[PDB]
From a paper:
Beta(β)-lactamases are bacterial enzymes that provide multi-drug resistance to β-lactam antibiotics. Mtb β-lactamase (BlaC) is a broad-spectrum Ambler class A3 β-lactamase capable of hydrolyzing all classes of β-lactam antibiotics used for the treatment of tuberculosis. Sulbactam (SUB), clavulanate and tazobactam, all β-lactam based suicide inhibitors, irreversibly bind to β-lactamases and block their activity. Here, we report in atomic detail (between 2.2 and 2.7 Å resolution) by room-temperature, time-resolved crystallography with millisecond time-resolution (with timepoints between 3 ms and 700 ms) how the Mycobacterium tuberculosis enzyme BlaC is inhibited by sulbactam (SUB).
Due to its smaller size, SUB should diffuse faster into the crystals than CEF, and the signature of an enzyme inhibitor complex is expected to appear at the earliest time points (3 ms and 6 ms). Nevertheless, contrary to expectations based on the size of the SUB, no electron density is present at the earliest time points. At 3, 6, and 15 ms, the DED features near the active site of subunit A are weak. At 6 and 15 ms, density features appear closer toward Ser70. These results could indicate an initial trace of SUB molecules migrating to the active site after being held up by the guardian residues.
Residue numbers in the entry:
A (entry chain C), B (entry chain B), C (entry chain A), D (entry chain D): 29 to 293
């Protein structure tokens, strides 16, 4: 059936594929390696922003945060420009979602506080919505470099999809803060060739990508059918065995998204 | 296999759906009511141009054709504007494909000459390409309103797909004339909500639409995978039971195109 | 001076140009041969529909009208298809506006009744909105062939623009009937290369074209600025020197429309 | 008389507008603050690509360039995705023009070599084409935030228009290399709401945008009339008085482009 093409796509792209689509009232749940651990990568920035939103008032977005030149460690296209000006929490939220700003993510983790620079506070927030599997242990860019098989900084397509469903479609945030998260994901600039490229243009797509070593390429997304029916699509992939320097294949994520669209149509 | 979704689409739209995709080297052929007769409607204008292209040298496209106001007996968005100046054979080809100009099609049939105002000459050209099923018996706009069950002005998704394959992908025309047909189909303006709306934007789509009474809506097309693999997609549909004035449902054709796209990925 | 470009366009196209744009609160009125008589041609079909709407209830649109093949005298892409079934008043309104159906216009004129097949009743309707200049004396297609200098079947850009302003922007019709006129004019299919081709795509354009002998080409339209400010643009032209068979030049109307857009910007 | 509308637009938008259109054989040059200095912003990426093309054979476009995470110090929608794989010189040209990739621009400046990371080499190339005014002193993103009144990283509408004319319309590049520059500018994705939005759709538009702080918004472009006559349109604007955080107003550039189109018609 459909689980055979996923294995076919795995051969043609030499990767390990993970797909989960939560079941709705009208459709059944799509699963393929759904409960196998994949690396969070940049996709954790999606619940991270929601974590800052959940515990703090809206005025917290206007707090100005200053940082130094030693604080930049990974790709940070926005943090590099404001070393003298500083950035507000809201600007750090925009950078972490739409541009995958690594340094902005580290500062938002620090805003959560606690041990591990906010990693313990973040996974603790992950447990509050019922995710007892995911875990964040390092910061950027260390979380992208974990060896295969290591359980640190990992989630699963099943686990990450249900969190995103509660955050965008559920009641994990008041409408209030919920529309801020959704709007940042709608104007994302880093995922044009992934799940968005696999769905027809008349489908609305909001997403948050993830990319790391060992050919790791992820994309969590919420799509809307042309009639307005929403779905949650979690697509993760790595190429463990091809080495640390294995190139990630975005086409595999886009090809799998077309397979999912064929079923939901 | 895929034929369960197609039947689950016929009930939702109160229509009869026909789908055929010729098999390539790596994939099998998709069929659903593939050998059932559907009305040609305006889709015959695509091989009609190929018949005029095939029978004449390239310089024949510069021949000026004159017509009167009585020749405008159907929707003719381009021929209606040049009644005083006349239009060349090449302009008649452009209008019949990109705008589905009914009057332009009738003049091109006259250019083929012969009995039935060129209908016998057109069906003969279809027989030369191996099409032993299709038949054109009337002109515009009579060909659209044949009663259900009548075999006049009908083809089948199997027959029309194999005809289109020889014209675009095969060698039924020399390269110079073949590129003229493909470009006219690429710049079509009437199929934005059919097969084009069912495939992702990174797939190239050239098509020719057809629409008539009894909720008739067809779309023949050639699609190109993002890597460059070509496919032929014939989608035809009617709702004859709903009556002469039944609206055609373009969403059904776009939804079926998304189901097919999921398989070709 | 904008009136120099209009005379420059007249020299470059070998034509006589007429332009009138009613003055709004913020802009001055554009005039060029504004009070010179030009042939109505198909542009009279816009106030003709308003005449049937104004004098008759909405239920009158469902009345079925029967006609014979001898009643088809002018370009009639829709009346030719429904000669056996007949057409309702509402369909005759649709045909007369979106496709410039000549036969549908004659049948709508007959619906106004009176002497001259409804021409005297129609000009009487023009007098009710304050237009003491325009006059319709013949039917289709005779009104398109009046010799130059003849005052029959003529209007002026000044007169026709102020009439159109009352019908779309004014209170000449109640809201329920006004929306029917605007919707047919918005989905017009015969004016894509005239006023529409001269304004940028972010401007909304509704129009009704006219074309006749002696190189007659007209276009009356209501445009909306990207911010929502409405304007009325009347553009008419003929080439009463190139002879009876002189080709009309659509580019002249489109070029003049870009000149007007430059002033309203 | 066009400079009065430009002055009204400056008051309407709280901005300073600069417009220059080089004179052709039949038309005179349009000027408004044509010799006043405006900030280059991203518009320098167009002649920068031409400088790299000019100094190297076509095979140099295949040279692979590698970079680190610190090379991403600005918005780089393409360079952020290929930091692991590296990008050839040709992709850097595509990214710097079609996506305004800041990091791709910095790498191309480095390919020119010399003092100042290639800025001195770039300004030298402008002097070879006769540009005695422009000057590039910094890299991205420092060049976008020079204080008002500072002459660094500035050009003029007069100077930038003549440079673009030599590169697209002149002989500053051989035909094989000229078509590469022209094709990249035709497929631009960042200028849909500027000069392109001010010209009618039947005009061909290739452009390169620029945006920075102090409300800086630029668009240099080459437009083609529907008959095929080309024009060069340089439109620059800033709102320095409103401060560093002043919003740029794209509508002003699109509105001014509509004023120019009315004159060139």
């Amino acid at each position: 059936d459909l689980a055979d093409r996923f294995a076919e796509l795995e051969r043609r792209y030499d990767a390990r594929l993970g797909v989960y689509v939560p079941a709705t009232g009208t459709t059944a749940a799509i699963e393929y390696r759904a409960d196998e651990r994949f690396a969070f990568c940049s996709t954790f920035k999606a619940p991270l922003v929601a974590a800052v939103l959940h515990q703090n008032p809206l005025t917290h977005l206007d707090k100005l945060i200053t940082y130094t030149s030693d604080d930049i460690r990974s790709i940070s296209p926005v943090a590099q420009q404001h070393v003298q000006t500083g950035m507000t929490i809201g600007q750090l939220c925009d950078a972490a979602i739409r541009y995958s700003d690594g340094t902005a993510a580290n500062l938002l983790l620090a805003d959560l506080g606690g041990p591990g620079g906010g990693t313990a506070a973040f996974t603790g927030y992950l447990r509050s919505l019922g995710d007892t599997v995911s875990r964040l242990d390092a910061e950027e860019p260390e979380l992208n470099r974990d060896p295969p098989g290591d359980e640190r900084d990992t989630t699963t397509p099943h686990a990450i999809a249900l969190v995103l469903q509660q955050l965008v479609l559920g009641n994990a945030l008041p409408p209030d803060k919920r529309a801020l998260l959704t709007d940042w994901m709608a104007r994302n600039t880093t995922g044009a060739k992934r799940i968005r490229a696999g769905f027809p243009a008349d489908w609305k797509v909001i997403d948050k990508t993830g990319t790391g070593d060992y050919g790791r390429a992820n994309d969590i997304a919420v799509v809307w059918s042309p009639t307005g029916v929403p779905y949650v699509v979690a697509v993760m992939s790595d190429r463990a065995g091809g080495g640390y320097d294995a190139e990630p294949r975005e086409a595999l994520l886009a090809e799998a998204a077309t397979c999912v669209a064929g079923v939901l149509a």
